[PDB]
Amino acid sequence: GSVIDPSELTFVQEIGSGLVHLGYWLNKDKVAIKTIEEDFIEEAEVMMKLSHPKLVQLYGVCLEQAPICLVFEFMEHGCLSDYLRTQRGLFAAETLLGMCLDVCEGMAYLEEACVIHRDLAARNCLVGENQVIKVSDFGMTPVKWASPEVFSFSRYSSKSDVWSFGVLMWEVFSEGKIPYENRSNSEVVEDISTGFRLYKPRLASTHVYQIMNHCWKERPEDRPAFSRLLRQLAEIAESG
Numbered sequence: 001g002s003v004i005d006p007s008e009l010t011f012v013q014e015i016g017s018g019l020v021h022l023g024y025w026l027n028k029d030k031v032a033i034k035t036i037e038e039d040f041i042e043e044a045e046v047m048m049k050l051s052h053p054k055l056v057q058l059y060g061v062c063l064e065q066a067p068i069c070l071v072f073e074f075m076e077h078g079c080l081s082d083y084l085r086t087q088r089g090l091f092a093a094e095t096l097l098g099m100c101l102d103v104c105e106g107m108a109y110l111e112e113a114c115v116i117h118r119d120l121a122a123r124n125c126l127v128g129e130n131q132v133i134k135v136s137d138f139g140m141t142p143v144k145w146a147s148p149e150v151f152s153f154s155r156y157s158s159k160s161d162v163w164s165f166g167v168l169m170w171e172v173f174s175e176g177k178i179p180y181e182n183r184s185n186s187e188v189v190e191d192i193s194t195g196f197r198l199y200k201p202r203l204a205s206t207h208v209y210q211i212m213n214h215c216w217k218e219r220p221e222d223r224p225a226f227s228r229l230l231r232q233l234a235e236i237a238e239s240g
């Protein structure tokens with residue numbers, strides 16, 4: 001990846017913190033500049049060699065002076081979680097399914113590359129023009145998105161990502177509701193262990209909910225891989 005000198009960046013507006021700015025690179029390209037080390041930089045290098053239409057891209061990294069930063073392409077509509085919330089009531093069900101399909105295409109690519117996301121959730125996906133969804137923050141090596149084998153034993157895998165993808169589906173079809181709202185981490189773990197699952201969102205069809213539930217099977221071996229999920233989702237986009 002290209003290294004970027006901080007003099008090449010113009011910071012126009014802070015858009016996020018707890019530090020992201022809209023800015024320009026070379027007074028030309030709009031960029032999202034994320035301000036903070038070896039870990040942060042390593043994620044950038046991993047992502048700069050993973051090229052898929054549904055995965056966010058980087059222009060480069062800025063190593064000039066601390067705080068260091070990453071320079072990403074600017075996704076015009078922000079994170080998926082906020083976007084679902086601010087546009088509540090304006091989505092057709094097909095648009096919502098299309099969003100899940102976008103994410104799943106990206107995850108199927110990561111799965112094939114043996115890359116485990118570990119923190120898949122609507123807040124880690126971004127929305128571009130024409131409501132295209134890209135997966136973000138996928139270069140790393142919250143109990144509400146965690147599978148049981150993750151919250152009890154730290155056993156991360158693509159199938160644990162599949163569990164998180166079911167929860168993300170629930171966030172999309174519920175248009176940005178918070179899962180297990182007001183329930184404590186302790187409460188979530190207990191509810192899940194006794195077989196509880198998130199309720200069917202009203203914009204979700206019976207078939208969509210079945211797929212959510214296949215993603216939340218107790219045993220990771222019982223969950224479908226993303227490459228299979230992708231086709232299941234696509235099948236339903238015609239009839240279901």
Ligand SMILES: C=CC(=O)N1CC[C@H](Nc2nc(CN3CCOCC3)cc(Nc3nc4cccnc4s3)n2)C1
Pocket residue numbers: 015016017020032034056072073074075076077078079082123126136
């Ligand atoms: C949970 C939200 C979060 O972490 N955010 C970081 C910045 C992001 N906000 C944001 N806002 C915009 C512009 N608004 C969108 C809604 O309409 C009003 C304008 C854009 C934007 N774009 C980003 N692109 C990237 C690329 C890589 C990494 N982060 C981003 S944020 N983000 C929120």
